[PDB]
Amino acid sequence: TAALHIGHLSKSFQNTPVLNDISLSLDPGEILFIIGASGCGKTTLLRCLAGFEQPDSGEISLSGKTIFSKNTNLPVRERRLGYLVQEGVLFPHLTVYRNIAYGLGNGKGRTAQERQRIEAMLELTGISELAGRYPHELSGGQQQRAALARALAPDPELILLDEPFSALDEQLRRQIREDMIAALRANGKSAVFVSHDREEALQYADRIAVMKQGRILQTASPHELYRQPADLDAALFIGEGIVFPAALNADGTADCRLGRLPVQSGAPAGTRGTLLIRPEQYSLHPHSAPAASIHAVVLKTTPKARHTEISLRAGQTVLTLNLPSAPTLSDGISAVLHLDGPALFFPGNT
Amino acid sequence: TAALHIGHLSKSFQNTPVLNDISLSLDPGEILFIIGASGCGKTTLLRCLAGFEQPDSGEISLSGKTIFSKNTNLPVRERRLGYLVQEGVLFPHLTVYRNIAYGLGNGKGRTAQERQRIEAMLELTGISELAGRYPHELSGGQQQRAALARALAPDPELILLDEPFSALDEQLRRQIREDMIAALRANGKSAVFVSHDREEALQYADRIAVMKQGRILQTASPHELYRQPADLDAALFIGEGIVFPAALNADGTADCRLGRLPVQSGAPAGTRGTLLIRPEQYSLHPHSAPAASIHAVVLKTTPKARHTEISLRAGQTVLTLNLLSDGISAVLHLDGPALFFPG
Ligand SMILES: Nc1ncnc2c1ncn2[C@@H]1O[C@H](COP(=O)(O)OP(=O)(O)OP(=O)(O)O)[C@@H](O)[C@H]1O
Ligand SMILES: Nc1ncnc2c1ncn2[C@@H]1O[C@H](COP(=O)(O)OP(=O)(O)OP(=O)(O)O)[C@@H](O)[C@H]1O
Ligand SMILES: [Ca+2]
Ligand SMILES: [Ca+2]
Ligand SMILES: [Ca+2]
């Protein structure tokens, strides 16, 4: 998948303003991430789209149909989208299986086709052995995965996922996220993810909308957000940074306590502001010979948002490395791989 | 702080084993992190400590007093610890102010001392302007912080914190955890945190217990857990790693297709195994000319699991970086330009 457009949307609770003149589009098949500080309005936005909250002005359209505006306000039932709530509350008196079955057909999961879709959701999320559990019989991350499976089962053209993975250990989240998003993309599905995992957003988002106090500071690709953030607030939200008051010079540097540093800016010389350094930009020299120095050949370089993925031939194997930046090889190909420190060795009774 | 002793503790549900021969110890004022894959038994362990669940076997003692055993089983209200449940669960019919007041004195929050302590908790967690709200008027991360404020207000000698920060954006979680753990340490408090944030555990834990399928895989300092893991299983849970089939040599190197690499092991030469390299150990050379170079002097050097914390006098600042004798001269390089934001 669905297109979505939200135009000038605003929402207040009593004297409490929360969404302030928000505009946002989602293209068919697009994976959009919405991120921002606690309390900035993410869940309220999703609830306004799904019809659980009523905006007090603005417009919302979904796949070419107005669903909210000065003269329309469709019931939740008439809004063709899926919405995994941040609470992920399951029906207490239903089994995991029957929770997942709920949004398919008559809800009972008696048909072979339902059984097969439900089992596929259980396998994706790694909870097949818990199909007969009731929700009170589950850990926090097991309950989270069952809620995710139930949301995903009907495979809506648009799905809104409000922190679908926040209770899950890293390796688990990484597997589910990759398998799930590949499958959404394979099927042309549109999705909006709320996340506060910076690496997740940078890796998987087509575009990221960064919110602050009910407004959108910036909506951009991961590469543009990270390297060309609109604001210092956006820059600090998307990554760690070390900041100093600074005065811009005319030669592409700025002065700060640390020193005179090259800086990306087109503002006039004499502008005052703040300069930000990413911790990965620093190194200290000289350096000891590395534990191992190996000769390597660069096969392929692929820029990502905040790193470059390098394909390598070193010794007699090929590795892929993620590094803050690419090496300068007068050759374009000839490099030296360093290992810092001993590796670990495990005798592996496999 | 209060010391804690858990001894050969187990628990099954129905006929479903969930905690299996847990032993675990906490010295006064120690900060322990418990981590492990989803379903491994972290919350069940905490519930058994707090008396919400009853173990089948084993002993729990608190500051030297046996609280669970074959012959003893102190009710919840009698166990002198605080416990922040992974759901948080605020009292829905009380404001945030009265929720945080609840564990102080008569719960009314009418004494100047109570008002002061509630203000301290509202400020630590950044929710001062929400203190008049009810829980259903709050965002998920605000509800989480109010629940944390409520649990921390009585300042118990032992506090159990099951995922107290999981709904919070990075800057917020960093500030709250730095301020709060510094305060706990300054006051000598003992704390057990459950987390799945690896950096967090490695930075703040005095020890980390890694659980797997109901058992303790390894309990150790962050340095030991990360640099001497018990298990390729434990190694990969605590951090990333690139692996290679390798064969052990006798000079403390291992053969693998990448080369003859120095390795840490005591095993017998000839042992075939897996070599594991952490991503931080890799670099590719040569690097580009640096955008800038700043002369620096090393002030101090604090070893951590994945890096060393170095204090440096450079230009006209002191900078502290995660990246050598503590008085040496060195040069800081900056790779690429910094960003500049007009005021
Ligand atoms: N009534 C019950 N019957 C059977 N198993 C149960 C019951 N209650 C909990 N469990 C199981 O106990 C195991 C441990 O649960 P616990 O909540 O302690 O895990 P956790 O480590 O805190 O998980 P997470 O990281 O997902 O929060 C889980 O596998 C869960 O399925
Ligand atoms: N009934 C209400 N009355 C007044 N303010 C409310 C009410 N409900 C929510 N809010 C406020 O609206 C703002 C947006 O809340 P929302 O749940 O959308 O935030 P969020 O970005 O999802 O936050 P988090 O990251 O903490 O989950 C918050 O500051 C919250 O306190
Ligand atoms: Ca939210
Ligand atoms: Ca748990
Ligand atoms: Ca070989």
Numbering used by the authors:
A (entry chain B): 2 to 351
B (entry chain A): 2 to 324, 330 to 349
From the article:
ABC transporters form one of the largest transporter gene families and use ATP to power the movement of a wide range of substrates across the membranes of both prokaryotic and eukaryotic cells. The TMDs bind the transported substrate and the NBDs provide the energy necessary for transport by binding and hydrolyzing two (or sometimes just one) molecules of ATP. We have solved the structure of the native nucleotide-binding domain, FbpC, from the N. gonorrhoeae iron-uptake ABC transporter, FbpABC (Lau et al., 2004). The first 240 amino acids of each FbpC monomer show the same overall ATPase topology and sequence motifs previously observed for other NBD structures from ABC transporters (Oswald et al., 2006).
FbpC consists of 352 amino acids and the structure shows a domain-swapped physiological dimer in the asymmetric unit cell (Smith et al., 2002). The crystal structure was determined to a final resolution of 1.9 Å and refined to a working R factor of 18.6% and Rfree of 23.4%. A notable feature of the FbpC structure is that it is trapped in the ATP-bound prehydrolysis state with a divalent metal ion cofactor, even though the protein is an active ATPase (Lau et al., 2004). A divalent metal ion is found coordinated between the β- and γ-phosphates of each ATP and the Q-loop glutamine (Gln87) in the electron density maps of FbpC. Given the high concentration of calcium in the crystallization conditions (0.2 M), it is highly probable that the ions observed in the active site of this structure are calcium. A striking feature of the FbpC active site is that neither of these residues makes any interaction with each other or the γ-phosphate of ATP. This suggests that the presence of calcium in the cofactor-binding site may have caused the catalytic dyad of His197 and Glu164 to adopt an unproductive conformation, although His197 still makes the trans interactions to the carbonyl oxygens of Ser167 and Leu169 on the D-loop of the opposing monomer as observed in HlyB. FbpC also contains an additional C-terminal regulatory domain of ∼110 amino acids (RD; residues 242–352) that adopts two OB-folds per monomer. Unlike MalK, the domains in FbpC undergo a substantial domain swap between the two monomers.
